[PDB]
């Protein structure tokens, strides 16, 4: 299998970075010049298999969230706070219901610097100073390089 295979190494992660929820979004675009992001896999948690994850997908405009920045030039940023951002979807906040205090935007491309699509994982954390560490973000581009292909 090359579709469950990659949601194996999803667990791991979801246990050596310590997550709630992943998701990865494909990137989609028609002949009459508009492109949108379309995620096929929602809602990962550390014990789930696919068929929980093919129900129920959502659909992002490109250029127009948190990963739609990441999406335009294809590297790993960092957020602060998505659903509460000047710059973010808040079509996915109706049906997730769920608001995150700090998510890791972190592209999926194949080895050529070519993109295929985009990695956002969402977990609630508590902390003073920053979001995020430079250790933390060599952790989410070494995964998805294995699994992006
Ligand atoms: N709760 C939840 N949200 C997701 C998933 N995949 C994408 N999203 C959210 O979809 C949102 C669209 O707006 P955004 O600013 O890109 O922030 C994105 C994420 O917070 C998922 O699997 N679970």
Known sequence: DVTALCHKIF?????????DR?????????????KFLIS??????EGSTLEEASNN??????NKGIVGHVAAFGEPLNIKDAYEDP?????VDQITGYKTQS???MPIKNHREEVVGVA????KKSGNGGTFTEKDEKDFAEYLAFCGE
Do not use: T
Request: hydrophobic share 50%; with cysteine.
């Open 57 to 62: 997908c959502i659909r992002l405009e490109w």
């Open 87 to 91: 710059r973010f979807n808040a079509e």
């Open 11 to 19: 667990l791991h992660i979801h246990g050596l970075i310590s997550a």
């Open 22 to 34: 992943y998701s990865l979004f494909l990137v989609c675009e028609d002949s009459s010049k508009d």
């Open 40 to 45: 096929r896999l929602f809602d990962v948690a």
């Open 120 to 123: 956002q994982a969402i977990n």
């Open 103 to 105: 998510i890791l935007c």
